[model samples]
Target: GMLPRLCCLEKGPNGYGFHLHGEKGKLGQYIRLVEPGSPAEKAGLLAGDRLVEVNGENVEKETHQQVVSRIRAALNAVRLLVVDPETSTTL
Candidate 1:
């Protein structure tokens, strides 16, 4: 059972006004918050929404890179899910 990865986060500046950090040792290098006015933010996520799941899958044991991959897949999956005829497309 794979854990969920947070795929909706964006990479922002780390040396300036950005204040963010990630977990160490396979949890995640950085838990990203969906950018303001972005889909993730619009979807009702906050800066502390921890990357717990991706596309209904858990990703607690996956590496940061793996988590990233999973997240991208999840986002794509979300798009596909919205495109399905039986699914109500709303973003």
Candidate 2:
């Protein structure tokens, strides 16, 4: 059995996003979110987003599997720090 652990999406110029292709039951170069609580989520990531990159690393040129791997790696390197506990963060 497999469980979703990361979330990847294709971000458009107008704040438009989409989920990964795997959950969509489609065979294509698509990205999806796995861990909902991941930094990606904190970064405003949503399901069904067409991944554009991972940590400034472009996913548009990489294969779906490669993108997923990179995304996981990037997500692992992420460190969620509170810039200002008093002030709410906004994207």
Candidate 3:
């Protein structure tokens, strides 16, 4: 299924400073933390946002390391599609 919404962010000098976690039984990789004053925060990302895609690729079934790899593999900035848990909608 297509996510209802999506947001893209370019890495700043500090890079996309955000932490992610995807537990074994979790439905999706979650934004565990977003560094203050960093690109992630400035990009409007928040903790608890579920990562749905990276670089236009669906990551719904990826592992924690795989998701991390995808983010790190970005040449300059990574494109992310996330879902907010509270609204149960993409952002």
Candidate 4:
């Protein structure tokens, strides 16, 4: 099984530097966009990582709307647990 990746991003002056793409029940949220020269990109966030947790909380069962709030609550920083689907299947 592949372990989830820990990503800690310093909130940029404009935004977190990434956008999420996912719905309520299709696939779990994933990083859809990562801007160049941003903290999120520097933090190693990629376009296809499956978001597993937010700020140390397990969010495997949470809805997109639910997880969105969790992320929004982080005012200064963001911590994310993500895994690659390629490795997830092994677990």
TM-score for each predicted model, relative to the true structure: 0.50, 0.40, 0.80, 0.85
Better of 1 and 3 by lDDT: 3
Can you give the lDDT of residue 85 in candidate 3? 66
Q: Candidate 3: give the clashing pairs.
A: none
Q: What is the lDDT of residue 75 in candidate 4?
A: 91
Over the full model, what C-alpha lDDT does candidate 3 score relative to the true structure? 0.80
lDDT of 3 by residue, 9-80 (tens): 787777788888877765678896798888888777878888888989999888888898898899888778
- List per-prediction Cα lDDT, in the order shown: 0.42, 0.42, 0.80, 0.86
Assess the local accuracy of residue 64 in candidate 3 as a C-alpha lDDT between 0 and 100. Answer: 87
Q: Judged by lDDT relative to the true structure, which candidate is superior, 1 or 4?
A: 4
Model 4 agreement with the true structure over 1-91: per-residue lDDT tens digits: 5788999989878878888888655757889778999998999998888899899998878888888899999999989999965623453
The residue-by-residue lDDT of candidate 2 on 1-91, one tens digit each, is: 1222333333323222224454334433443543554444555544444445455555555666775565446422532111111234588
For model 3, the stretches where C-alpha displacement exceeds 4 angstroms are 1-4, 87-91
What's the lDDT for residue 29 in model 3? 86
* lDDT for 37 (candidate 4): 92
For candidate 1, give the lDDT: 0.42
- TM-score, model 1 to reference: 0.50
Better-scoring candidate (TM-score), 1 or 3: 3
Give a tens-digit lDDT track for model 1, residues 21-74: 356643543334445565454444445445455566565566767766665564
Highest TM-score scorer: 4
